Design a protein around this ligand. Structure first.
Ligand code: CLA
Ligand code: CLA
Ligand code: CLA
Ligand code: CLA
Ligand code: CLA
Ligand code: CLA
Ligand code: CLA
Ligand code: LHG
Ligand code: WVN
Ligand code: WVN
Ligand code: PQN
Ligand code: SF4
Ligand code: SF4
Lengths: 73, 742, 73, 151, 138, 30, 42, 60, 80
């Protein structure tokens, strides 16, 4: 929760779009859509059927986490 | 005679006394609560009739009357659906314009701004869009007005009252004896010939006499209000004979076996109706009539009061060979004494039948204008897939319950059950090995393809533009079934479904059905399905076969079907019961059905569903991305999960915003479930001790001592909230996406 | 030594990549930071810390590494 | 006429005598395998087993490896098979080190000297079989394309 | 003493029986006498039919033998059963009932092992017995 | 930049640290 | 009124459901006749 | 203490410590815990009676 | 092997001995209770640690106590 708050606030200030955080952080759907879904696009495009770039390792590691977390269950 | 009616009159007096005594059915529970555990035990074991008494007759009577109560509830639900279709729906406007009017049969009151959920569904109507498919069913049945829906609702209410009265009469006034219930041959004869056979015959009658002329007039472009009433189709043979001239010949061709004269309203055309995108109703009428004939013939098989007929005990005992000892001996006694074995078999069959229904109903749309209603198709496939999986796991669970409780080794010496028990280790070891093999050579392909695409080696992947795993067998079966009309099915005009191959059937510029090609991704996901089903079988079968004893616990049958453990000893014996195996198999059923419905949604949205435009090209919803993206987990994550969730998270401020709310709420409850799943009883009991101290300080401690939920109840509550959360999340995501884009 | 001259435009390199499971496009896509070999872009902030406390070249970085090796011994 | 019987006329041992487990064909095949065949030193058992497994180890590495579309595919596959052979020989060595105490008996597989002889034979057979497979694929164009050369 | 020549109940065999550790580490034996030939459930899974007279059976664990003893006690009223431990060297150690009288009945000559002369709430805290071989019981 | 000799010197110091770490591990293992 | 039926009606689940529906009906009618009460009006 | 009296428990490990029970029987023989006390609240094991010594019971 | 202790709060109801699946406990003569008997654990090398005896004990907080210790083949319930 702390790192989600820190990262979403700092990304919205650095983008010059702090009003997006000011209007979307008051409800959970804003957190899910404007922070989690919105900022996932370069991460899930680290590799695709069209190519790959330098983020691909994080694109792997992300999925890696989604695997290993589930294994703990 | 041997098959007769025996009934006891007034066995239980109708009184409200036991209504005021919770736990009356159980001698342990009738003493009254001392702890909060009592309440949960009261609601958990209440319909577990065999644990309250040893008399099979009373248990069977309770089962019969509870089945009547469920039938009453189902009839009340159907009457409700008919009434809400009659009064709160846009059904006439949908009948006038099926291709442009969204079905809607739920209207909300304006209270707190929830009237925004009454979306613009077309036809001058505002309401919640419905995906149960009732509009297409009523169009197929020939219902053209809401008055007929009102009468259907009244009939449903009357049948609900009749069922609940029959339950009260057949428990409380005239309860059948145990000898009446123990007639398997008579029950099968009556239920095959009368329930299925006469039901199919009467529905074929309704289809031929009512559904075919009304639907023929509807497909010709006649407005519903000028269509003649069904009784006019019954009495005016000329009015029918303009549409089907063979009705001018009457019933003489039927009794003289000149049946081809009836070839215009009993057809075997196949394919789909080009106007509506559904199956030809003449094909369905011959189909249900043939099913009626086959079921009535099958309903004369079993021996009864008269000398003709088969004896199932003799049939079972005659089938035995050198590999199997005594063979099928002793199973008739098991299935005529243990209700749990019958519940296992019937739940397993109903689940498999529901799965077959889901597959065969997406692939061959049977109703007019249901094929281009993509939300209805997705909803009924997902719903019946989930019901089928639940019923299969319940069949396994109640098989385990039979194994713990009703199994007698003295009556089961060297039969098939005994030999299955005696090589349970070989069964579970070979199945475990094949499950690990399936897991490696199915999921490691996805992991390998993810790594290769991440490593920048596209030529090293498993894909159609790389090293190929071609589904040659399924493609060959598709080629045979496409070639089947005129070669192995000479009397079929078209294929059974266009999914095997053929033309693109499109209705109102939307694809009703088109060929569904199978490539490397389809190979991988079908072997993923096989892997998940085999692992679920491994869990459930291992729980059933080791329900009575094991090398760990030699007296597991004495502990019962449902116990938390046998202590921390032997290293730890946690989750050793068959119930905990069902508890894990429900999770794996959830995983299996989730992957199945994800495959279904993506494959129909990418390769089947879409819009037809000029020059005959088909523009799919996701533009054919399944072939190159469904070979990696990253492709599933981005192009299916991330891409299609845009509709449910941007639904706020629109009519679909409730799905987004439900989306979040399911996301909440599933996570809440892990609090039960990951934790243990002692922590919560000590925290409850502290809270009890707090309530003692203000002298407000309850007389019923609060206790933490049991270990089994902790597992069950976590599983129930987990399943509710996951199914609700998939529900909201699927429904919001398919309503928005389809 | 490149990063000290232009701190706000040059991407800091943490360490080199030698992975024989790489294909050629992964070798190309990780070749950043003004060097001719695949590298990882540093997120630890050691560049800013070491630059602020007075290190400018690669020689004193190596001397500090030697001193800490000796101190660990 | 029962086809499934208790194993070794003991009904309480954890095994059953089945046609798959205890028929004449199964007993003949198991007794004629080098791991069970009488009259063999452990060295020759190792030689036969290593020849077979090292011979078949070349194929998947040649046909599916990362260098399979290059001119050095067979050389890379044989070298990878040899590395796998060396790894398995190390596995055999540590198994024999930890599993057996030093005894005079050396004519059985489950002795220290017998397992060392078996490991030596398995290494020599594996290298010989892998080299034979390399020679055959190098010298026969039918094996290089796995049968598409006929088309 | 254990008579090795006692005939066994008629069983068709199963995969649940004893493994290599029975012939290598230790094995257990149970004998009992039945008044008639009757079908019982094996503790390893499966049904066997015990003969009239004496029955000898071999198991891998003591708990399996005692589970069978409890089963035949509550289902066939057989209480004369005897459980022995057998080693690979052939030494047979009689286990149950140890002095001929069942453990739930008091017999003379039995001495108490593990008895503590105070209530459980009078056990010591670990801090008295840290860095010391004194027991927590006192 | 750094030369080969400097890397070799660092490797020699790391080997000395390896010997000292092995000695500390043996001392801790009694 | 049969006393056993009244005692059944006095059970915790029936009274719980009736009381919570009664409370919900108060909240629903209050928000129907006096909507959008974010605040206590001054 | 006597028959019928209400007593408070001073045994620390007891479930009913500082709670009130009723004396059901006082044994006269040389028993370490001769005071049978019956409680209205059941324990975690579901029992509602226990034996205590004379110093573990105080009259209220 | 696990350690099983019997404290002098035992009332000699013989339930723990009857609940034991491994024949670890037995009843011996005693003068501390009205029943004239106390439980004892001479055979804790066969104790698996299932704590069925602790479940069976009716005295408020238990008189028989099982402390899990070093695991052996018998205590781990291994048939292999
Ligand atoms: C041909 C006669 C006949 C028919 C039609 C049925 C029909 C049925 N039996 Mg059944 N039964 C029969 C003979 C028959 N039984 C005999 C002879 C025995 C004794 C051996 C039994 C013993 C038996 C048991 C023990 C149980 C059933 C159950 C059921 C129901 C299954 C649930 C279902 O699909 O409901 C949906 C199907 C419907 C048709 C819904 C309508 C329900 C009503 C009752 C149908 C009445 C039709 C009526 C006779 C004809 C009027 C139609 C028209 C002329 C107006 C179903 C209603 C089960 C149940 O749920 O019991 C309550 C059950 O547990 N039966
Ligand atoms: C069994 C299936 C079923 C289902 C799921 C529904 C569901 C619904 N119906 Mg429906 N209905 C059904 C059967 C069903 N009905 C049948 C069989 C009929 C024919 C009699 C109707 C006739 C009907 C009408 C005429 C109306 C609905 C309405 C509604 C909606 C609101 C219901 C509501 O809040 O009342 C809750 C009513 C209560 C009295 C609350 C009871 C709470 C507890 C039990 C008692 C509290 C007492 C306490 C003192 C206060 C809801 C979507 C309404 C609607 O959609 O409005 C546009 C509406 O006007 N239904
Ligand atoms: C249980 C189902 C059921 C029921 C209740 C009915 C009911 C009816 N059918 Mg029907 N029918 C059914 C199934 C059913 N059908 C099926 C499955 C077929 C296909 C073989 C037919 C084929 C059929 C034909 C071809 C005709 C009827 C006719 C009739 C009407 C009887 C008038 C008469 O005696 O003419 C007897 C006429 C003679 C010449 C003798 C009546 C409304 C007749 C009618 O009035 O047409 C509407 C008629 O001509 N039916
Ligand atoms: C044909 C259907 C059928 C029938 C007749 C039975 C009948 C029985 N089952 Mg069975 N079972 C079934 C299907 C069926 N089951 C299926 C499909 C499964 C798999 C999930 C199981 C799994 C199962 C287990 C694991 C067990 C039983 C048990 C029992 C027995 C007692 C049940 C009881 O008292 O519950 C009383 C009723 C309840 C406790 C109500 C349950 C309410 C559920 C959990 C929540 C429903 C959520 C709702 C749909 C959504 C709400 C969400 C909303 C709030 C947002 C009884 C013989 C138990 C037993 O003792 O057998 C001997 C047992 O241990 N069954
Ligand atoms: C995504 C998480 C995850 C994963 C990977 C697994 C994996 C497994 N579960 Mg499990 N499970 C999970 C979640 C998961 N589970 C959850 C959440 C539940 C909750 C109820 C369960 C409940 C459950 C039950 C009840 C059962 C299993 C079983 C199994 C095994 C099935 C055999 C198999 O498929 O082998 C294939 C192995 C995999 C797919 C794992 C990934 C391996 C791939 C191929 C990559 C390999 C890389 C390589 C090894 C790395 C080497 C590097 C080196 C440095 C080490 C397997 C070990 C069953 C079992 O063991 O019976 C056989 C069984 O009965 N699980
Ligand atoms: C098939 C999958 C795969 C494999 C096997 C590798 C293998 C490797 N990659 Mg890699 N990579 C892959 C896919 C893969 N990659 C993909 C898909 C991407 C995305 C493009 C990358 C991106 C990538 C980058 C960007 C980098 C690598 C690097 C490396 C190398 C790390 C060397 C190292 O430090 O070893 C030693 C290994 C470890 C220290 C990890 C083990 C840690 C353990 C598990 C912790 C617990 C230890 C504990 C004390 C127990 C000890 C056990 C005892 C036996 C020692 C190694 C050769 C790095 C490199 O070149 O460095 C030389 C590097 O910078 N890779
Ligand atoms: C603890 C948190 C919390 C708090 C402080 C409130 C407080 C309030 N809510 Mg809210 N609400 C909550 C949780 C909460 N709610 C939750 C969890 C949900 C989702 C189920 C809602 C859903 C919700 C809706 C849909 C509505 C409210 C409304 C209201 C207002 C009450 C108006 C009223 O009854 O007048 C009292 C009037 C008298 C005459 C007395 C008030 C500002 C209503 C409102 O006016 O919004 C501002 C309204 O329409 N809330
Ligand atoms: C497929 C299996 C099949 O061919 O079964 C055929 C065979 C049936 O044996 P019989 O002919 O003795 O069976 C007679 C009865 O089973 C039915 O009348 O089953 C077996 O041998 C046991 C199952 C082995 C299954 C191995 C897995
Ligand atoms: C097909 C059949 C149909 C279906 C059913 C089925 C039964 C499963 C299946 C059978 C299947 C499978 C099991 C087929 C069985 C297969 C195995 C893999 C065949 C291995 C053959 C090894 C031979 C060629 C070589 C020895 C090397 C020679 C001597 C060496 C020369 C070397 C020596 C040391 C001397 C120095 C020179 C060099 C070159 C170094
Ligand atoms: C975790 C725990 C384990 C147990 C112990 C512990 C202390 C409790 C702790 C360990 C801890 C930490 C402290 C362990 C960390 C340990 C050490 C520092 C690992 C360093 C290894 C350096 C490699 C082997 C060598 C390069 C040198 C090669 C041989 C040189 C070539 C040379 C160059 C080219 C120049 C020419 C000359 C030659 C000689 C040829
Ligand atoms: C939270 C939790 C509990 C605590 C749950 C408590 C004991 C039961 C909660 C039931 C409440 C009282 C009923 C529903 C709550 C309603 C929202 C409000 C209560 C209404 C009152 C008038 C009753 C367990 O007992 C438990 C047991 C085993 C594994 C995990 C867990 C676990 O995670
Ligand atoms: S833990 Fe189990 S085996 Fe050990 S003494 Fe108690 S009941 Fe017997
Ligand atoms: S169960 Fe408890 S009270 Fe009964 S004899 Fe055993 S130790 Fe004593």
């Amino acid at each position: 929760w702390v790192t989600f708050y820190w990262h979403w606030k700092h990304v919205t200030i650095w983008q010059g779009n702090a009003g997006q955080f000011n209007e979307s952080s008051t409800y959970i759907m804003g957190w899910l859509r404007d922070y989690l879904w919105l900022n996932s696009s370069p991460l899930i495009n680290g590799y695709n059927p069209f190519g790959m770039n330098s983020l691909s390792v994080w694109s792997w590691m992300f999925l890696f986490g989604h695997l290993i977390w589930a294994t703990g269950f | 005679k041997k098959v007769s009616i025996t009934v006891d009159r007034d066995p239980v007096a109708t009184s409200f006394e036991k209504w005021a005594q919770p736990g009356h059915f159980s001698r342990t529970l009738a003493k009254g609560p001392k702890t909060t555990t009592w309440i949960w035990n009261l609601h958990a074991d209440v319909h577990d009739f065999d644990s309250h008494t040893n008399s099979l007759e009373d248990i069977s009577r309770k089962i019969f009357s509870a089945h009547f109560g469920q039938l009453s509830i189902i009839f009340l639900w159907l009457s409700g659906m008919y009434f809400h279709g009659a009064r709160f729906s846009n059904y006439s406007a949908w009948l006038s314009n099926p291709t442009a009017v969204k079905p809607s049969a739920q209207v909300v009151w304006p209270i707190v701004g929830q009237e925004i959920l009454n979306g613009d569904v077309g036809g001058g109507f505002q309401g919640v869009q419905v995906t149960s498919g009732f509009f297409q069913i009523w169009r197929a049945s020939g219902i053209t007005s809401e008055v007929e829906l009102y009468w259907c609702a009244l009939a449903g209410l009357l049948m609900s009252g009749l069922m609940i009265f029959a339950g009260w009469f057949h428990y409380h006034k005239a309860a059948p004896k145990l000898e009446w219930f123990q007639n398997a041959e008579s029950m099968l004869n009556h239920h095959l010939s009368g329930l299925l056979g006469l039901g199919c015959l009467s529905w074929a009658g309704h289809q031929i006499h009512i559904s075919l002329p009304v639907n023929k007039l509807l497909d010709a472009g006649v407005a519903p209000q000028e269509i003649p009433l069904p009784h006019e189709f019954l009495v005016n043979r000329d009015l029918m004979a303009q549409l089907y001239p063979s009705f001018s010949k009457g019933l003489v061709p039927f009794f003289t076996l000149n049946w081809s004269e009836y070839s215009d309203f009993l057809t075997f055309k196949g394919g789909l109706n080009p106007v509506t995108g559904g199956l030809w109703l003449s094909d369905t009428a011959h189909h249900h009539l043939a099913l009626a004939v086959l079921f009535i013939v099958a309903g004369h098989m079993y021996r009864t009061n008269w000398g003709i007929g088969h004896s199932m005990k003799e049939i079972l005992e005659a089938h035995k060979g050198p590999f199997t000892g005594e063979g099928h001996k002793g199973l008739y006694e098991i299935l005529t004494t243990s209700w749990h074995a019958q519940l296992a078999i019937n739940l397993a069959m109903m689940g498999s039948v529901s799965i077959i229904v889901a597959h065969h109903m997406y692939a061959m749309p049977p109703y007019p204008y249901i094929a281009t209603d993509y939300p209805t198709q997705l909803s009924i496939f997902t719903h019946h897939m989930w019901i089928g999986g639940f019923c299969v796991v319940g069949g396994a669970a109640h098989a385990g319950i039979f194994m713990v409780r009703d199994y007698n080794p003295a009556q089961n010496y060297n039969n098939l059950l005994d030999r299955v028990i005696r090589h349970r280790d070989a069964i579970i070891s070979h199945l475990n090995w094949i499950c690990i093999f399936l897991g490696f050579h199915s999921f490691g392909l996805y992991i390998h393809n993810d790594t290769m695409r991440a490593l920048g080696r596209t030529q090293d992947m498993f894909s159609d533009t790389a090293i190929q795993l071609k589904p040659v067998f399924a493609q060959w079966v598709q080629s045979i079934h496409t070639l089947a009309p005129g070669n192995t099915t000479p009397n079929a005009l078209a294929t059974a479904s266009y999914a095997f191959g053929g033309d693109v059937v499109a209705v109102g510029n939307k694809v009703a059905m088109m060929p569904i090609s199978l490539g490397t991704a389809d190979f991988m996901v079908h072997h993923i399905h096989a892997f998940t089903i085999h692992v679920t079988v491994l869990i459930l079968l291992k729980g059933v076969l080791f329900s009575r004893n094991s090398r760990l616990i030699p007296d597991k049958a004495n502990l019962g079907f449902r116990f938390p453990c046998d202590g921390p000893g032997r290293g730890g014996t946690c989750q050793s019961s068959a119930w905990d195996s069902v508890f894990l198999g429900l999770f794996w059923m959830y995983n299996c059905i989730s992957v199945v419905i994800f495959h279904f949604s993506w494959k129909m949205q990418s390769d089947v569903w879409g819009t037809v435009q000029a020059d005959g090209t088909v523009t799919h919803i996701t533009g054919g991305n399944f072939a190159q993206s469904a070979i990696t987990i990253n492709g599933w994550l981005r192009d299916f999960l991330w891409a299609q969730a845009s509709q449910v998270i941007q639904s706020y401020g629109s009519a679909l915003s409730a799905y987004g709310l439900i989306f979040l709420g399911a996301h909440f409850i599933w996570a809440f479930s892990l609090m039960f799943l990951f934790s243990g009883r002692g922590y919560w009991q000590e925290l409850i001790e502290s809270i009890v101290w707090a309530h003692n300080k203000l002298n407000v401690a309850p007389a019923i001592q609060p206790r933490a939920l049991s270990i089994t109840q902790g597992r069950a509550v976590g599983l129930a909230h987990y399943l509710l959360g996951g199914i609700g999340t998939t529900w909201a995501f699927f429904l919001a996406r398919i309503i928005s884009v389809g | 030594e490149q990063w000290v001259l232009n701190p706000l435009k040059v991407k800091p390199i943490a360490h080199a990549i030698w992975d024989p499971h790489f294909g050629q496009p992964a070798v190309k896509a990780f070749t950043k930071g003004g060097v001719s070999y695949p590298v990882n872009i540093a997120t630890s902030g050691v560049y800013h810390w070491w630059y602020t406390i007075g290190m400018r070249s690669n020689t004193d970085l190596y001397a500090g590494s030697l001193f800490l090796l000796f101190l660990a011994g | 006429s029962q086809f499934i019987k208790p194993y070794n006329d003991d009904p309480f041992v954890g095994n059953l005598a089945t046609p798959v487990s205890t028929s004449s064909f199964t007993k003949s095949l198991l007794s004629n395998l080098p791991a069970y065949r009488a009259g063999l030193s452990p060295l020759l058992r190792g030689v036969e087993i290593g020849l077979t497994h090292g011979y078949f180890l070349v194929g998947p590495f040649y046909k599916l490896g990362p260098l399979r579309n290059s001119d050095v595919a067979l050389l890379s596959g044989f070298f990878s098979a040899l590395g796998l052979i060396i790894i398995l020989v190390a596995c055999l060595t540590i198994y024999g080190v930890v599993s057996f105490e030093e005894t005079e008996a050396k004519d059985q597989l489950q002795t220290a000297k017998g397992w060392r002889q078996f490991t030596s034979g398995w290494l020599v057979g594996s290298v010989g079989g892998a080299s034979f497979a390399y020679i055959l694929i190098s010298n026969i164009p039918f094996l290089q394309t796995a049968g598409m050369s006929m088309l | 003493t254990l008579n090795l020549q006692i005939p066994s109940p008629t069983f068709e065999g199963s995969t649940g029986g004893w493994l290599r550790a029975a012939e290598v580490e230790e094995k257990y034996a149970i004998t009992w006498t039945s008044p008639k030939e009757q079908v019982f459930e094996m503790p390893t899974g499966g049904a066997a039919i015990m003969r009239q007279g004496e029955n000898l059976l071999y198991l891998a664990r003591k708990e399996q033998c005692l589970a069978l003893a409890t089963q035949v006690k509550n289902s066939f009223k057989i209480t004369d059963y005897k459980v022995y431990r057998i080693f690979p060297s052939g030494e047979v150690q009689y286990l149950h009932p140890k002095d001929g009288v069942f453990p739930e009945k008091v017999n003379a000559g039995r001495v108490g092992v593990g008895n503590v002369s105070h209530s459980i709430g009078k056990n010591l805290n670990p801090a008295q017995i840290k860095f010391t071989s004194k027991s927590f019981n006192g | 930049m750094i030369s080969d000799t400097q890397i070799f010197i660092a490797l020699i110091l790391a080997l000395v640290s390896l010997v000292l770490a092995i000695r500390l591990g043996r001392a801790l293992y009694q | 009124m049969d006393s056993n039926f009244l005692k059944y009606l006095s059970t915790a689940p029936v009274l719980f459901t009736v009381w919570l529906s009664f409370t919900a009906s108060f909240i629903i009618e209050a928000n129907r006749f006096f909507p959008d009460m974010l605040y206590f009006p001054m | 203490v006597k028959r019928g009296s209400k007593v408070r428990i001073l045994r620390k490990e007891s479930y009913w410590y500082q709670d009130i029970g009723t004396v059901a029987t006082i044994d006269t023989s040389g028993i370490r815990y001769p005071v049978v006390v019956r409680f209205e609240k059941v324990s975690y094991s579901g029992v509602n009676t226990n034996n205590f010594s004379l110093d573990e019971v105080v009259e209220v | 092997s696990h350690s099983v202790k019997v404290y002098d709060t035992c009332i000699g109801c013989t339930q723990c001995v009857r609940a034991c699946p491994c024949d670890v406990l037995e009843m011996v003569s005693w003068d501390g209770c009205k029943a004239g008997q106390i439980a004892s654990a001479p055979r804790t090398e066969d104790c698996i640690g299932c704590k069925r005896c602790e479940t069976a004990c009716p005295t408020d907080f238990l008189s028989v106590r099982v402390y899990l210790g070093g695991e052996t083949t018998r205590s781990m319930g291994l048939a292999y």
